[PDB]
Amino acid sequence: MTEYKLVVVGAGGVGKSALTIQLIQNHFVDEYDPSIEDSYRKQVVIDGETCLLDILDTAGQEEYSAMRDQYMRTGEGFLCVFAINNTKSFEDIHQYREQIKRVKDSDDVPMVLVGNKCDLAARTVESRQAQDLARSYGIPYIETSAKTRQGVEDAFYTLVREIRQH
């Protein structure tokens, strides 16, 4: 078993927290203990190798950059999740990556680009806009929904495959 520190990033209101709990308990965030590190570690078997999946969910808002620089250096990979319905979130995914490359000191880092909010009926950033961006970064692009719960784990599982290969 290996400790996999998956750094979940998005913007603050994309649904990263909701998508996280899904891979943990597979339930919609109804009751939790805030004012602390919303991280959850689960044991799974990926690539024929049982390992731990420590999912760290930082705070999208509030001042705490000092915490970020630490999470990037403590995490083995980063997950970029944004809501297609929110064109603003799509922008954060760009500046967010700039931080990973800096801390990691490399343009090619193990990460994944997931598109939360796929069940909604008001998509602003079509998958094409996200695909052209992810494909340009050399990372995979997956779509999930924290509400309907579609391919939620499929997105996370991608991270493990990224780190393993990178």
Ligand SMILES: Nc1nc2c(ncn2[C@@H]2O[C@H](COP(=O)(O)OP(=O)(O)NP(=O)(O)O)[C@@H](O)[C@H]2O)c(=O)[nH]1
């Ligand atoms: N319809 C839909 N709603 C979502 C999805 N993901 C998150 N939401 C909801 O949209 C709202 C986002 O709230 P926001 O403050 O941005 O997230 P937060 O800071 O974690 N607070 P909360 O835990 O309530 O989300 C919440 O009700 C959240 O549960 C999604 O994929 N689809």
Ligand SMILES: O=[N+]([O-])c1ccc(NNC(=S)Nc2ccc(F)cc2)c([N+](=O)[O-])c1
């Ligand atoms: O940059 N900071 O302000 C800062 C950095 C690190 C730490 N603690 N050290 C660590 S390893 N914290 C930590 C480490 C791993 C996690 F998943 C969550 C938190 C702390 N801290 O207050 O314990 C603060």
Ligand SMILES: [Mg+2]
């Ligand atoms: Mg939440």
